[PDB]
């Protein structure tokens, strides 16, 4: 058995109770209609995607052609000639039909302190925030830096940017001032939106102070709009800082939506890679939205009356596509969850799902492991409407898949392990909720329009048939594919499209078993996934070298029972300090300062010299004889 994971792995059918309890009708009649539609999406994408786009997205001007360009040309364009606006499709068209339908359920950090926001209320808040940016000089095509925690104002900000055709560039609120600065400079943003403070798990995040530090080196930022989240006294810079609540009160509660081209940029999302600084992955407008709506509908079985709850942060692509764009495009309710799965206690996810009658839940296996370690007594909730259990970031493995399926889902929900990445925009290999039979540990089958191949890692040759393993690549473009790396299309080409010419390179290894099901093996480059966070080891090495006592640095990923992988750092010193215990703390702090707390290495080892650097020798072990003794200590 070449794909060793799939050996004697039975395939599980969709639970019968899923159909009998379903509030509506499934979007597909069964696996046969999936197969028909899938073959059409590969053999005639021009027809398949034109119909899908006209089903799901309201265009101001119809498009002339479904797709032009090729993978090797790096010139792909989708729905060319079309015009539309993302905020119109997420807000206006739903407010017009059903103004009092709840668009957003805000669950605050403290339980009992949220609110519900209707589509009409959302149109007001998006409109008047867009008025603020317009009045302060933001124009179509400008980037806007967003440094916000998980509050509904974050949705207001993304959609207000989209409404005027500004390009939002969301920076995860766990990033340091250095990381925020680098992203604001590269994007050349002149406007930033933040909070006075964030509250997460009962802890205060000093967002305004972090922004102040970053802006000292962003001289082109001329306004900082501050949302009063906590009311605490924060430093204030007159002439630059503005209060969200003071400014929006000045402006009307409606604003026209800017007419955007299908291929106008919608957002940038800075993303860590195998080498170099983070890349501003750029998504344009029509194709991204089509993919978001298509996966939201067919993967997550989203219907307009649903209450969809993605547990991912707006700072990441999961938050972009499935907290914001997909559910709002489809017109359902989305949950914005400010807290952690552990605050006030380990029942929190289920408290929220029960109070709001959540129908689909989307989670990371790290959170599941963390909760399973806490004990099954924290779960004692009916959650009658919960029929889809989504998982992302790493394979949800046997022990966790069983615990997610039995203890959380009561054998009534369909577990959908969705494989994708920032660069694909939306799900690309995934079961379809309520339709696709699954296997624990497997992402199952390609989504519509996704033509995956397994490549020999060295020769680059395609390996045909089933029970094969190698490099995961896609053979054809798809609507929501990232279109460039901001300011560096050559890097985009070299990273994704010139490695295996004619294919799109995922950076992941994979196996395709006897049934054609995919088994994601993980990154083949120097990217590690820690608590669902995509980290570059080269970035962490660069951060450690910023320390005055560090000469060389080597960072590797090692398996971790809770976080999947954990980053361990090896450092060689420049001259020799007599404070090695204290030096380790300053090294840890250096990474927390250069990147952010969440990227900190678990341990920083000090060696005389390092093994180009043979990182493979370090990853297996966790002067070759000396490091084995140094580790064994
Ligand atoms: C599982 C999870 C909830 C754990 O949260 P946690 O209790 O903060 O633990 P973490 O290991 O992530 O955090 C480590 C550090 O990052 C920081 N951090 C994490 N998330 C943060 C955020 N949203 N804002 C600010 N800081 C954050 C913590 O405060 C902590 O800092 P500290 O060293 O000063 O204590 C979080 O890691 C997570 O969401 N992982 C999943 C990512 C993902 O794949 N989401 C998609 C799901 S659909
Ligand atoms: C959506 C977050 O996208 P990113 O933060 O850009 O990380 C994307 C990288 O995470 C990994 N990955 C994501 N989903 C899965 C999964 N279901 N099974 C296995 N691995 C997965 C993979 O290595 C990919 O290349």
* Ligand having the closest approach to the CA of 425: 2
Pocket test for ligand 1, best of 211, 296, 366, 427 (most atoms within 8 A of CB): 366
CA 242 / ligand 2 centre spacing (Å): 38
- Burial class from Cβ neighbours inside 10 Å (0-12, 13-18, 19+) for residue 206 reads middle
Identify the residue whose C-alpha is closest to ligand 1 atom 35.
Answer: 597
Which atom of ligand 2 is nearest to 533's Cα? 5
Q: Which atom of ligand 1 is nearest to the CA of 391?
A: 48
Q: What torsion, rounded to 10 degrees, do the Cα atoms 289, 292, 298, 299 define?
A: 170
Inside any domain, residue 564: no
State in Å: Cα 506 to ligand 2 middle: 10
Would 625 be classed as within a structural domain?
no
CATH number at residue 66: 3.40.50.12780
CA distance linking residue 597 with residue 610, whole number of Å: 26
> Which structural domain range is residue 352 located in?
4-507
Question: Cβ neighbours of residue 584 under 8 Å, at least 6 residues apart?
Answer: 603, 604, 606
CA–CA gap between residue 81 and residue 63 (Å, rounded):
5
Question: Does 413 fall in a domain?
Answer: yes
Check the CA dihedral 591-595-597-598 and report its sign: negative
Residues paired with residue 510 on neighbouring β-strands, in sequence order: 470, 520
Q: How far from the centroid of its chain's Cα atoms is residue 433's Cα? A: 20
Breakpoints of the chain, after residues (C–N > 2.5 Å): 611, 622
End-to-end CA distance of the chain: 39
Which residues does residue 605 pair with via DSSP β-bridges, in sequence order? 570
Buried b (16+ CB within 10 A) or exposed e, 264-296: bbbbbbbbbbeeebbbbbbbbbbbbbbbbbbbb
Report how far residue 505's alpha carbon sits from residue 274's, in angstroms, rounded to the nearest whole number: 13
Longest dimension (CA), the chain: 71
Is 49 contained in some domain?
yes
Q: Please state, in angstroms and rounded to a whole number, the distance separating the CA atoms of residues 180 and 169.
A: 10
Q: Of 155, 190, 159, 183, nearest to 169 (Cα)?
A: 183
Contact 312, 364 (CB under 8 A): yes
Closest Cα partner for 611 from 601, 602, 624?
Answer: 624
348 marked among binding-site residues: no
| Closest residue to atom 17 of ligand 2, CA basis | 419
Question: Which residue has its alpha carbon closest to ligand 1 atom 2?
Answer: 367
Ligand 1 mean position, distance from CA 618 (Å)? 26
Q: Are 451 and 473 in contact (CB under 8 A)?
A: no
Is residue 458 assigned to a domain?
A: yes
Query: Is 619 annotated to bind ligand?
Result: no
Between CA 272 and CA 284, with CA 316 as vertex, the angle to 5 degrees is: 85
Which protein residue's CA is at the shortest distance from atom 11 of ligand 2? 393
Residue 240 burial (CB count, 10 A): 13
Question: Residue 622 domain-assigned?
Answer: no
Q: Counting ligands in written order, which one lies closest to the CA of residue 527?
A: 2
> H or E stretch including 45?
helix 45-56
Tell me which residue of 476, 471, 467 sits closest to 447, measured CA to CA.
476
Taking only Cα atoms into account, the Rg of the chain, rounded to an integer number of angstroms, comes to 24
- Does residue 237 sit within a domain? yes
Dihedral Cα 177, 178, 181, 185, nearest 10 deg: 180
Residue 114 and residue 106: Cα distance in Å, rounded?
A: 5
- Whether 67 is covered by a domain: the verdict is yes
According to DSSP, residue 468 is labeled E
The Å distance, Cα 349 to ligand 1 centre, comes to 15
- Which ligand is the nearest neighbour of the Cα of 197? 1
**Ligand 1, atom 37: nearest CA belongs to which residue?**
531
Answer whether 470's CB lies under 8 Å from 455's CB. yes
DSSP string, 124-155: HHHHHHHHHHHHTT--TT-EEEEE--SSHHHH
Number of domains in the chain: 1
Grouping H, G, I as helix, E, B as strand and the rest as coil, residue 275 is: coil
Query: This structure's resolution (angstroms)?
Result: 1.9
Gap between the Cα atoms of 295 and 52, Å rounded: 11
């Amino acid at each position: 058995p070449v794909v060793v994971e799939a050996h004697q792995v039975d395939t599980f059918d969709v639970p019968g109770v899923f159909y009998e309890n379903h509030p509506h009708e499934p979007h597909l009649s069964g696996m046969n209609e999936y197969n028909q539609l899938y073959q059409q999406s590969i053999n005639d994408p021009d027809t398949f995607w034109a119909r899908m786009a006209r089903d799901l997205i309201t265009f101001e001007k119809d498009f002339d052609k479904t797709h032009i360009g090729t993978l090797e040309g790096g010139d792909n364009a989708w729905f060319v000639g079309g015009r539309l606006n993302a905020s119109f499709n997420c807000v206006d068209r739903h407010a017009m039909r059903d103004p009092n339908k709840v668009a957003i359920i805000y669950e605050a950090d403290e339980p009992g302190h949220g609110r519900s926001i209707t589509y009409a209320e959302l149109l007001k808040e998006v409109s008047r925030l867009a008025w603020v940016m317009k009045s302060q000089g933001v124009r179509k095509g400008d980037t806007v830096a967003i440094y916000l925690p998980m509050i509904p104002e974050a949705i207001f900000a993304l959609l207000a940017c989209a409404r005027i055709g500004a390009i939002h560039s969301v920076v995860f609120a766990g990033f340091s001032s250095d990381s925020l600065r680098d992203r604001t400079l590269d994007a050349r943003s002149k406007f930033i939106i933040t909070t006075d403070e964030g509250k997460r798990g009962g802890k205060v995040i000093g967002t305004k102070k972090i922004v102040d530090e970053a802006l000292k080196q962003c001289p082109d930022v001329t306004n900082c709009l501050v949302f009063k989240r906590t009311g605490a006294d924060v430093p204030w810079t007159k002439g630059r800082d503005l209060w969200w609540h003071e400014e929006v009160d000045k402006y009307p509660n409606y604003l026209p939506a800017e007419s955007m081209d299908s291929e106008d940029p919608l957002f940038l999302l800075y993303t860590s890679g195998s080498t170099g600084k983070p890349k501003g992955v750029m998504h344009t407008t029509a194709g991204y939205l089509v993919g978001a709506a298509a996966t939201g509908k067919y993967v997550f079985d989203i219907h307009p009356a649903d209450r969809f709850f993605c547990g991912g942060d707006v700072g990441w692509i999961t938050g972009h596509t499935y907290v914001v764009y997909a559910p709002l495009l489809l017109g359902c309710t989305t949950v914005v969850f400010e807290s952690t799965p552990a605050y006030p206690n380990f029942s929190r996810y289920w408290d929220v799902i029960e109070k709001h009658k959540v129908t689909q839940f989307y989670v990371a296996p790290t959170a599941l492991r963390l909760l399973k370690r806490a004990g099954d007594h924290h779960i004692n909730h009916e959650m009658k409407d919960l029929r889809i259990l989504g998982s992302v970031g790493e394979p949800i493995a046997a022990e966790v898949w069983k615990w997610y399926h039995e203890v959380v889902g009561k054998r009534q929900a369909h577990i959908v392990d969705t494989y994708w990445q920032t660069e694909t925009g939306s799900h690309v290999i995934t079961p379809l909720g309520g339709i696709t039979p699954t296997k624990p540990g497997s992402a199952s089958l390609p989504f519509f329009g996704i033509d995956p191949v397994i490549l020999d890692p060295v020769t680059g040759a395609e390996i045909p048939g089933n029970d094969v393993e190698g490099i995961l690549a896609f053979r054809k473009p798809w609507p929501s594919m990232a279109r460039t790396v901001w300011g560096d299309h050559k890097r985009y080409m070299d990273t994704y499209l010139n490695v295996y010419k004619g294919f799109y390179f995922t950076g992941d290894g994979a196996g395709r078993d006897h049934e054609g099901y995919y088994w994601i093996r993980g990154r083949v480059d120097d990217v590690v996934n820690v608590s669902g966070h995509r980290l570059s080891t080269a970035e962490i090495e660069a951060a450690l070298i910023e320390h005055h006592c560090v000469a060389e640095a080597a960072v590797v990923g090692v398996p971790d029972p809770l976080t999947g992988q954990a980053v361990h750092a090896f450092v060689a010193l420049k001259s020799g300090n007599d404070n090695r215990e204290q030096l380790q703390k300053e090294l840890i702090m250096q990474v927390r300062k250069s990147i952010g707390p969440f990227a900190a290495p678990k341990v920083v080892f000090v060696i005389d010299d390092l093994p180009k650097i043979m990182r493979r020798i370090l990853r297996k072990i966790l002067i070759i004889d000396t490091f084995h003794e140094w580790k064994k200590a």
